[PDB]
Amino acid sequence: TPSLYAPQQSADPKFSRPVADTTRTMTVISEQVIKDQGATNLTDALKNVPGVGAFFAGENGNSTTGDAIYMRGADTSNSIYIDGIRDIGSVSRDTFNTEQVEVIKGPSGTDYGRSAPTGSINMISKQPRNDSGIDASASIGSAWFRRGTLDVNQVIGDTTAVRLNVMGEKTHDAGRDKVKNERYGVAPSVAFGLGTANRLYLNYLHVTQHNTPDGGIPTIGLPGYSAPSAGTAALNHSGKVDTHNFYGTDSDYDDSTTDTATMRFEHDINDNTTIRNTTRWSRVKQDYLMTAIMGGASNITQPTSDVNSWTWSRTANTKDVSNKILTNQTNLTSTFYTGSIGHDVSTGVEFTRETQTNYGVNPVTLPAVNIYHPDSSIHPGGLTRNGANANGQTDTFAIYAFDTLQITRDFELNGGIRLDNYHTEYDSATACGGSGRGAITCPTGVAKGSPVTTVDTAKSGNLMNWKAGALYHLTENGNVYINYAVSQQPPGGNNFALAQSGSGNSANRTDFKPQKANTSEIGTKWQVLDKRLLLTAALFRTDIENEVEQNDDGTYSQYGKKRVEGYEISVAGNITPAWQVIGGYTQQKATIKNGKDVAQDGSSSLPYTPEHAFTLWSQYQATDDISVGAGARYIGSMHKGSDGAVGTPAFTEGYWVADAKLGYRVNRNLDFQLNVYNLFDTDYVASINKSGYRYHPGEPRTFLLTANMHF
Ligand SMILES: C[C@H](CO)OC[C@@H](C)OC[C@@H](C)OC[C@@H](C)OC[C@@H](C)OC[C@H](C)OC[C@@H](C)O
Ligand SMILES: C[C@H](CO)OC[C@@H](C)OC[C@@H](C)OC[C@@H](C)OC[C@@H](C)OC[C@H](C)OC[C@@H](C)O
Ligand SMILES: C[C@H](CO)OC[C@@H](C)OC[C@@H](C)OC[C@@H](C)OC[C@@H](C)OC[C@H](C)OC[C@@H](C)O
Ligand SMILES: CCCCCCCCO[C@@H]1O[C@H](CO)[C@@H](O)[C@H](O)[C@H]1O
């Protein structure tokens, strides 16, 4: 029987082997792991994968929000999937309706189509089970954190089950003033034909959120900060601001809703062959107003020369966006023999429509904020739509075919090919006659404030991708393997935006080529102690090509190159029946290989990427009633991107966070759980923005008390 900390196989029918026999760097985080840790959203689940987190805080005119995940050196937020279907949206994803999260490092275009040059994150949705039972949870923790979840599964006939998951969460922020979050979700589903050759699964998901967003705090007093001028020199001695200070306003808010409907048909043609057809409709809506602060010399106001009277200036960051996907996917898996060669085939076709609409809003002006005594109890405004919108649409037709050839009992080959036909359409417009960062002058005879179109173009293309691997069983517990994969991101694949062809430095020029990523991997996997403990180690290199760089004249072309190289170590499962573990270590050297350096200190490293990262979680059943857990994470130092701001830190220091846990079983119906996070109340930078004026502080020590009920 498999370990609860080491799921043996991916739920995705595109992966024809268990994790231990998959020639990929694959980590599966189970619901048991997430539950034992008290992790309630994707970001906190991903802390079980080293060097994966929200490391970029944004620029000056925008901020990152939600699951802005960085992995293998780049933003991977557009390659988060639900049940293998892309889920774009700068919102945080609750884990209440999720069975496991599958993280594959090293991109492959065969898996899910276009992607970031990093890998893939896949949340697996709960489905109705064959048993009947009720699980309920109630949590109270630091800063009046309150959470309730309910999971109900009921079998009805010989062949029908229904499942319902419900979540409610309300909290302030233990480390931040005025930041509060609130969300509610419901996920009901019904399954027909269980235990039969013909199955229907119907799913629905709704999540509503109302958060107070957080733009960060000034970087005064951090390692590397210097006052930007002689005239502001008191900022070299006035110290770090209180990490609780809120620099936003009482008008700052972040709203979203998620609505997703899925319908899955399954038909067993025989005991070896199954056809599947999945249809999903999904919409994620979000609008927010949040505060970005700036601290350059010309941003600083000095009423009194006492630094307590000084102000930084505020910039509004607004978003009013809608992301929709409609898709239909057919999958066929079959196992059969051609002579002595055994085949496990997985082939399919996908139709997809993806749309993004960014609704223009009126500019919001914010007053200066006191550096050490921010007054946030003011109501500057809210969002008013102005009719100047950006519309993106991408239509995709994809056909794929994978095969894992069993050549002998000890030697396996695997390959895959995928073809994507896409058409992308993009147009944008701005309100004319403004004075800000993207203001466009009104043309003749057009009323001031009218939507003027700045881009309206389209792009059609092909994406041909493939992968190939080889695996050898050294024993019945250990193998070795190599793997090579190609992945691409065409113009308009990152965020639907396109640029007019012929000029500019945008990777989205319709005349440019896709950014191509080629990954190589050599590793070994060992299933130890009765196949209950999985140990892995791999060497990898990703070469990224067609990056936009500038020619000797003004021209731009695609001669740039980037590279991420290193090794990966993972462990997962049971060391003894009483002792569970999960964790990993990575070393990844992300660097510019051709082109301008992008790191502030002028070296070749990529920003917002730690070079060393370590995570380890362990849980031990000390007695029949009492269990104990512990966790430790190390994130290394990283570089800020280059910006013209003067005196702001060019890098951030690595940090250690430790966690602990306690579990007490009262009876089969009731058990308690005490999680405490950042055990040593360590201070650190969790992310820095591009210019370097603001950062997100690391959360302080927090507690979380949970009551688990089962019926
Ligand atoms: C609570 C049940 C448990 O089976 O499930 C609730 C969930 C299924 O629906 C909750 C949602 C509809 O509303 C969210 C809000 C009420 O916050 C949750 C919290 C207050 O719950 C009790 C929480 C122990 O706080 C109360 C206080 C005593 O700590
Ligand atoms: C016990 C619990 C009650 O709490 O559950 C009740 C149960 C009885 O109902 C759950 C189920 C019915 O919900 C899913 C439903 C919303 O189906 C979606 C389907 C219509 O997708 C269409 C598809 C994507 O859209 C395109 C298609 C039309 O081509
Ligand atoms: C409802 C369903 C989802 O449930 O979706 C509706 C559907 C509309 O989705 C789109 C699908 C039909 O895609 C095919 C086509 C629209 O894509 C353009 C492609 C053919 O052009 C590239 C072409 C090779 O490039 C030519 C190049 C040489 O210039
Ligand atoms: C039984 C296991 C629980 C261990 C509790 C450790 C609590 C540590 O306590 C913390 O220690 C830090 C040491 O760096 C100090 O800097 C903090 O001020 C102190 O609060």
PDB file of C-alpha atoms in Angstrom, residues 30-225:
ATOM      1  CA  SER A  30      -0.987  14.961  -1.358  1.00  0.00           C
ATOM      2  CA  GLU A  31      -3.966  16.232   0.584  1.00  0.00           C
ATOM      3  CA  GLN A  32      -2.537  14.440   3.626  1.00  0.00           C
ATOM      4  CA  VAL A  33       0.622  16.568   3.422  1.00  0.00           C
ATOM      5  CA  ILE A  34      -1.358  19.782   2.959  1.00  0.00           C
ATOM      6  CA  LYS A  35      -3.706  18.907   5.820  1.00  0.00           C
ATOM      7  CA  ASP A  36      -0.945  17.996   8.271  1.00  0.00           C
ATOM      8  CA  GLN A  37       0.708  21.375   7.501  1.00  0.00           C
ATOM      9  CA  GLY A  38      -2.418  23.517   7.731  1.00  0.00           C
ATOM     10  CA  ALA A  39      -1.930  24.734   4.163  1.00  0.00           C
ATOM     11  CA  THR A  40      -5.137  26.207   2.767  1.00  0.00           C
ATOM     12  CA  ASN A  41      -4.079  27.613  -0.611  1.00  0.00           C
ATOM     13  CA  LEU A  42      -1.789  26.647  -3.512  1.00  0.00           C
ATOM     14  CA  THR A  43       1.091  28.939  -2.567  1.00  0.00           C
ATOM     15  CA  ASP A  44       1.432  27.355   0.856  1.00  0.00           C
ATOM     16  CA  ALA A  45       1.159  23.909  -0.727  1.00  0.00           C
ATOM     17  CA  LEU A  46       4.048  24.722  -3.071  1.00  0.00           C
ATOM     18  CA  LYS A  47       6.313  25.318  -0.107  1.00  0.00           C
ATOM     19  CA  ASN A  48       6.744  21.541  -0.297  1.00  0.00           C
ATOM     20  CA  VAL A  49       8.742  22.063  -3.550  1.00  0.00           C
ATOM     21  CA  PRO A  50      12.132  23.798  -3.112  1.00  0.00           C
ATOM     22  CA  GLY A  51      12.783  27.180  -4.699  1.00  0.00           C
ATOM     23  CA  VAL A  52       9.109  27.735  -5.695  1.00  0.00           C
ATOM     24  CA  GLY A  53       7.339  30.842  -4.397  1.00  0.00           C
ATOM     25  CA  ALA A  54       6.069  34.397  -4.897  1.00  0.00           C
ATOM     26  CA  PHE A  55       9.402  36.233  -5.225  1.00  0.00           C
ATOM     27  CA  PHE A  56       8.552  39.304  -7.365  1.00  0.00           C
ATOM     28  CA  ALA A  57       6.410  42.081  -5.861  1.00  0.00           C
ATOM     29  CA  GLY A  58       5.797  43.902  -9.173  1.00  0.00           C
ATOM     30  CA  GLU A  59       6.994  47.174 -10.642  1.00  0.00           C
ATOM     31  CA  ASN A  60       5.735  50.685  -9.827  1.00  0.00           C
ATOM     32  CA  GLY A  61       2.606  50.785 -12.005  1.00  0.00           C
ATOM     33  CA  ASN A  62       1.602  47.213 -11.162  1.00  0.00           C
ATOM     34  CA  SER A  63       1.777  44.764  -8.269  1.00  0.00           C
ATOM     35  CA  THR A  64       1.618  40.965  -8.126  1.00  0.00           C
ATOM     36  CA  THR A  65      -1.382  39.438  -6.354  1.00  0.00           C
ATOM     37  CA  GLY A  66      -2.458  35.892  -5.557  1.00  0.00           C
ATOM     38  CA  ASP A  67      -0.478  32.909  -6.876  1.00  0.00           C
ATOM     39  CA  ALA A  68       2.316  34.883  -8.595  1.00  0.00           C
ATOM     40  CA  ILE A  69       4.579  31.840  -8.531  1.00  0.00           C
ATOM     41  CA  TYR A  70       8.208  31.842  -9.684  1.00  0.00           C
ATOM     42  CA  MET A  71       9.827  28.511 -10.603  1.00  0.00           C
ATOM     43  CA  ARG A  72      13.082  27.633 -12.411  1.00  0.00           C
ATOM     44  CA  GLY A  73      13.871  31.309 -12.935  1.00  0.00           C
ATOM     45  CA  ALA A  74      10.672  32.759 -14.378  1.00  0.00           C
ATOM     46  CA  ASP A  75       7.078  33.716 -13.721  1.00  0.00           C
ATOM     47  CA  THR A  76       5.084  30.505 -14.057  1.00  0.00           C
ATOM     48  CA  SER A  77       1.691  31.917 -13.098  1.00  0.00           C
ATOM     49  CA  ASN A  78       0.220  31.318 -16.599  1.00  0.00           C
ATOM     50  CA  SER A  79       1.059  27.583 -16.322  1.00  0.00           C
ATOM     51  CA  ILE A  80      -1.088  26.688 -13.351  1.00  0.00           C
ATOM     52  CA  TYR A  81      -3.631  24.055 -14.406  1.00  0.00           C
ATOM     53  CA  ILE A  82      -6.763  22.582 -12.883  1.00  0.00           C
ATOM     54  CA  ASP A  83      -7.296  18.965 -13.998  1.00  0.00           C
ATOM     55  CA  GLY A  84      -4.907  19.662 -16.829  1.00  0.00           C
ATOM     56  CA  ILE A  85      -6.882  22.682 -18.046  1.00  0.00           C
ATOM     57  CA  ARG A  86      -5.198  26.096 -17.807  1.00  0.00           C
ATOM     58  CA  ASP A  87      -6.452  28.395 -15.000  1.00  0.00           C
ATOM     59  CA  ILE A  88      -5.215  31.965 -15.607  1.00  0.00           C
ATOM     60  CA  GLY A  89      -5.909  34.570 -12.928  1.00  0.00           C
ATOM     61  CA  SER A  90      -3.952  36.617 -10.407  1.00  0.00           C
ATOM     62  CA  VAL A  91      -5.981  35.248  -7.479  1.00  0.00           C
ATOM     63  CA  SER A  92      -5.026  32.847  -4.714  1.00  0.00           C
ATOM     64  CA  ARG A  93      -6.357  29.300  -5.090  1.00  0.00           C
ATOM     65  CA  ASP A  94      -7.895  27.612  -2.053  1.00  0.00           C
ATOM     66  CA  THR A  95      -7.045  23.921  -1.636  1.00  0.00           C
ATOM     67  CA  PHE A  96     -10.423  22.851  -0.204  1.00  0.00           C
ATOM     68  CA  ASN A  97     -11.539  21.101  -3.401  1.00  0.00           C
ATOM     69  CA  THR A  98      -8.155  19.581  -4.292  1.00  0.00           C
ATOM     70  CA  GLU A  99      -6.896  16.006  -3.938  1.00  0.00           C
ATOM     71  CA  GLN A 100      -3.237  16.517  -4.909  1.00  0.00           C
ATOM     72  CA  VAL A 101      -0.991  19.059  -6.624  1.00  0.00           C
ATOM     73  CA  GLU A 102       1.388  17.802  -9.344  1.00  0.00           C
ATOM     74  CA  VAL A 103       4.554  19.867  -9.948  1.00  0.00           C
ATOM     75  CA  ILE A 104       6.711  18.931 -12.926  1.00  0.00           C
ATOM     76  CA  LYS A 105       9.944  20.920 -13.227  1.00  0.00           C
ATOM     77  CA  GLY A 106      11.324  21.320 -16.703  1.00  0.00           C
ATOM     78  CA  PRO A 107       8.910  22.500 -19.345  1.00  0.00           C
ATOM     79  CA  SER A 108       7.487  20.244 -22.030  1.00  0.00           C
ATOM     80  CA  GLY A 109       5.175  21.569 -24.719  1.00  0.00           C
ATOM     81  CA  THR A 110       3.630  18.144 -25.214  1.00  0.00           C
ATOM     82  CA  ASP A 111       1.986  18.178 -21.782  1.00  0.00           C
ATOM     83  CA  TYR A 112      -0.352  21.168 -21.772  1.00  0.00           C
ATOM     84  CA  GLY A 113       0.470  23.244 -24.858  1.00  0.00           C
ATOM     85  CA  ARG A 114       2.178  26.628 -24.592  1.00  0.00           C
ATOM     86  CA  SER A 115       3.747  27.234 -21.188  1.00  0.00           C
ATOM     87  CA  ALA A 116       6.322  29.311 -19.385  1.00  0.00           C
ATOM     88  CA  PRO A 117       9.888  27.913 -19.695  1.00  0.00           C
ATOM     89  CA  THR A 118       9.754  26.446 -16.203  1.00  0.00           C
ATOM     90  CA  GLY A 119       7.401  23.485 -15.813  1.00  0.00           C
ATOM     91  CA  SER A 120       3.799  22.888 -14.876  1.00  0.00           C
ATOM     92  CA  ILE A 121       1.612  23.083 -11.770  1.00  0.00           C
ATOM     93  CA  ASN A 122      -1.557  20.994 -11.803  1.00  0.00           C
ATOM     94  CA  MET A 123      -4.283  20.997  -9.163  1.00  0.00           C
ATOM     95  CA  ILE A 124      -6.327  17.796  -9.104  1.00  0.00           C
ATOM     96  CA  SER A 125      -9.981  18.268  -8.251  1.00  0.00           C
ATOM     97  CA  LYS A 126     -11.820  16.094  -5.771  1.00  0.00           C
ATOM     98  CA  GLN A 127     -14.303  13.682  -7.375  1.00  0.00           C
ATOM     99  CA  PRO A 128     -17.060  11.610  -5.781  1.00  0.00           C
ATOM    100  CA  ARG A 129     -15.750   8.566  -3.934  1.00  0.00           C
ATOM    101  CA  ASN A 130     -17.122   5.026  -3.635  1.00  0.00           C
ATOM    102  CA  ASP A 131     -17.643   5.273   0.156  1.00  0.00           C
ATOM    103  CA  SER A 132     -19.857   7.504   2.297  1.00  0.00           C
ATOM    104  CA  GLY A 133     -18.565   9.783   5.018  1.00  0.00           C
ATOM    105  CA  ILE A 134     -18.412  13.304   6.365  1.00  0.00           C
ATOM    106  CA  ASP A 135     -15.327  15.316   7.292  1.00  0.00           C
ATOM    107  CA  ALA A 136     -15.563  18.768   8.826  1.00  0.00           C
ATOM    108  CA  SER A 137     -12.957  21.215  10.114  1.00  0.00           C
ATOM    109  CA  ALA A 138     -12.928  24.372  12.174  1.00  0.00           C
ATOM    110  CA  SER A 139      -9.752  26.406  12.664  1.00  0.00           C
ATOM    111  CA  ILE A 140      -8.995  29.437  14.780  1.00  0.00           C
ATOM    112  CA  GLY A 141      -5.574  31.099  14.653  1.00  0.00           C
ATOM    113  CA  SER A 142      -3.466  34.254  14.939  1.00  0.00           C
ATOM    114  CA  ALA A 143      -5.090  37.625  14.261  1.00  0.00           C
ATOM    115  CA  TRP A 144      -8.573  36.108  14.485  1.00  0.00           C
ATOM    116  CA  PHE A 145      -7.996  33.667  11.634  1.00  0.00           C
ATOM    117  CA  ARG A 146     -11.193  31.618  11.217  1.00  0.00           C
ATOM    118  CA  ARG A 147     -11.753  28.783   8.780  1.00  0.00           C
ATOM    119  CA  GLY A 148     -14.349  26.109   8.301  1.00  0.00           C
ATOM    120  CA  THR A 149     -14.419  23.373   5.682  1.00  0.00           C
ATOM    121  CA  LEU A 150     -16.892  20.604   4.981  1.00  0.00           C
ATOM    122  CA  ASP A 151     -16.459  17.519   2.789  1.00  0.00           C
ATOM    123  CA  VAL A 152     -19.548  15.320   2.287  1.00  0.00           C
ATOM    124  CA  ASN A 153     -19.648  12.171   0.139  1.00  0.00           C
ATOM    125  CA  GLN A 154     -22.814  10.132  -0.294  1.00  0.00           C
ATOM    126  CA  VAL A 155     -23.284   6.975  -2.385  1.00  0.00           C
ATOM    127  CA  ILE A 156     -26.856   6.731  -3.642  1.00  0.00           C
ATOM    128  CA  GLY A 157     -27.462   3.591  -5.609  1.00  0.00           C
ATOM    129  CA  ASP A 158     -25.352   0.824  -6.978  1.00  0.00           C
ATOM    130  CA  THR A 159     -23.513   3.293  -9.166  1.00  0.00           C
ATOM    131  CA  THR A 160     -24.021   6.917  -8.127  1.00  0.00           C
ATOM    132  CA  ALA A 161     -22.197   9.148  -5.722  1.00  0.00           C
ATOM    133  CA  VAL A 162     -22.421  12.818  -4.891  1.00  0.00           C
ATOM    134  CA  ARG A 163     -19.774  14.963  -3.305  1.00  0.00           C
ATOM    135  CA  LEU A 164     -19.884  18.383  -1.754  1.00  0.00           C
ATOM    136  CA  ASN A 165     -17.060  20.516  -0.422  1.00  0.00           C
ATOM    137  CA  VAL A 166     -17.638  23.836   1.308  1.00  0.00           C
ATOM    138  CA  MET A 167     -15.146  26.334   2.652  1.00  0.00           C
ATOM    139  CA  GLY A 168     -15.314  29.565   4.574  1.00  0.00           C
ATOM    140  CA  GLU A 169     -12.337  31.636   5.685  1.00  0.00           C
ATOM    141  CA  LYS A 170     -12.043  35.064   7.346  1.00  0.00           C
ATOM    142  CA  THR A 171      -8.838  36.621   8.641  1.00  0.00           C
ATOM    143  CA  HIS A 172      -6.776  39.682   9.409  1.00  0.00           C
ATOM    144  CA  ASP A 173      -3.000  39.577   8.889  1.00  0.00           C
ATOM    145  CA  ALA A 174      -0.882  38.930  11.992  1.00  0.00           C
ATOM    146  CA  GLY A 175       2.022  40.834  10.455  1.00  0.00           C
ATOM    147  CA  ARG A 176       0.178  43.581   8.575  1.00  0.00           C
ATOM    148  CA  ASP A 177      -2.212  46.329   9.643  1.00  0.00           C
ATOM    149  CA  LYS A 178      -5.609  46.605   7.940  1.00  0.00           C
ATOM    150  CA  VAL A 179      -4.901  43.697   5.583  1.00  0.00           C
ATOM    151  CA  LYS A 180      -7.809  41.291   5.856  1.00  0.00           C
ATOM    152  CA  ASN A 181      -9.008  38.454   3.678  1.00  0.00           C
ATOM    153  CA  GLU A 182     -12.310  36.706   3.280  1.00  0.00           C
ATOM    154  CA  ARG A 183     -13.375  33.946   0.928  1.00  0.00           C
ATOM    155  CA  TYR A 184     -16.141  31.384   0.474  1.00  0.00           C
ATOM    156  CA  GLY A 185     -16.394  28.435  -1.854  1.00  0.00           C
ATOM    157  CA  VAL A 186     -18.659  25.602  -2.847  1.00  0.00           C
ATOM    158  CA  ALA A 187     -17.914  22.629  -5.064  1.00  0.00           C
ATOM    159  CA  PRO A 188     -20.719  20.141  -5.598  1.00  0.00           C
ATOM    160  CA  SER A 189     -20.411  17.191  -7.953  1.00  0.00           C
ATOM    161  CA  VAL A 190     -22.244  14.055  -8.995  1.00  0.00           C
ATOM    162  CA  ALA A 191     -20.914  10.899 -10.671  1.00  0.00           C
ATOM    163  CA  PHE A 192     -22.929   8.331 -12.616  1.00  0.00           C
ATOM    164  CA  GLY A 193     -21.959   4.803 -13.585  1.00  0.00           C
ATOM    165  CA  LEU A 194     -19.209   4.142 -11.044  1.00  0.00           C
ATOM    166  CA  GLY A 195     -17.826   0.627 -11.235  1.00  0.00           C
ATOM    167  CA  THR A 196     -19.120   0.362 -14.797  1.00  0.00           C
ATOM    168  CA  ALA A 197     -17.677   0.759 -18.282  1.00  0.00           C
ATOM    169  CA  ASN A 198     -19.500   4.089 -18.820  1.00  0.00           C
ATOM    170  CA  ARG A 199     -19.041   7.001 -16.454  1.00  0.00           C
ATOM    171  CA  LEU A 200     -20.211  10.606 -16.192  1.00  0.00           C
ATOM    172  CA  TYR A 201     -18.725  13.115 -13.743  1.00  0.00           C
ATOM    173  CA  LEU A 202     -20.309  16.531 -13.312  1.00  0.00           C
ATOM    174  CA  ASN A 203     -18.467  19.214 -11.354  1.00  0.00           C
ATOM    175  CA  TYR A 204     -19.173  22.790 -10.383  1.00  0.00           C
ATOM    176  CA  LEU A 205     -16.878  25.218  -8.544  1.00  0.00           C
ATOM    177  CA  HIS A 206     -17.589  28.659  -7.076  1.00  0.00           C
ATOM    178  CA  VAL A 207     -15.254  30.781  -4.982  1.00  0.00           C
ATOM    179  CA  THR A 208     -15.881  34.360  -3.894  1.00  0.00           C
ATOM    180  CA  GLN A 209     -13.213  36.570  -2.349  1.00  0.00           C
ATOM    181  CA  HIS A 210     -13.030  39.992  -0.716  1.00  0.00           C
ATOM    182  CA  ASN A 211      -9.449  40.902   0.288  1.00  0.00           C
ATOM    183  CA  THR A 212      -7.589  44.007   1.425  1.00  0.00           C
ATOM    184  CA  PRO A 213      -4.577  44.010  -0.932  1.00  0.00           C
ATOM    185  CA  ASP A 214      -1.013  44.792   0.200  1.00  0.00           C
ATOM    186  CA  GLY A 215       1.478  46.744  -1.909  1.00  0.00           C
ATOM    187  CA  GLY A 216       4.383  46.284   0.510  1.00  0.00           C
ATOM    188  CA  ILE A 217       6.437  48.592   2.688  1.00  0.00           C
ATOM    189  CA  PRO A 218       9.511  50.791   2.174  1.00  0.00           C
ATOM    190  CA  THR A 219      12.893  49.112   1.948  1.00  0.00           C
ATOM    191  CA  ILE A 220      14.542  51.713   4.231  1.00  0.00           C
ATOM    192  CA  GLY A 221      17.064  50.040   6.523  1.00  0.00           C
ATOM    193  CA  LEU A 222      17.321  46.688   4.718  1.00  0.00           C
ATOM    194  CA  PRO A 223      20.755  45.313   3.745  1.00  0.00           C
ATOM    195  CA  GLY A 224      21.896  47.495   0.823  1.00  0.00           C
ATOM    196  CA  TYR A 225      19.481  50.462   1.222  1.00  0.00           C
TER     197      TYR A 225
END
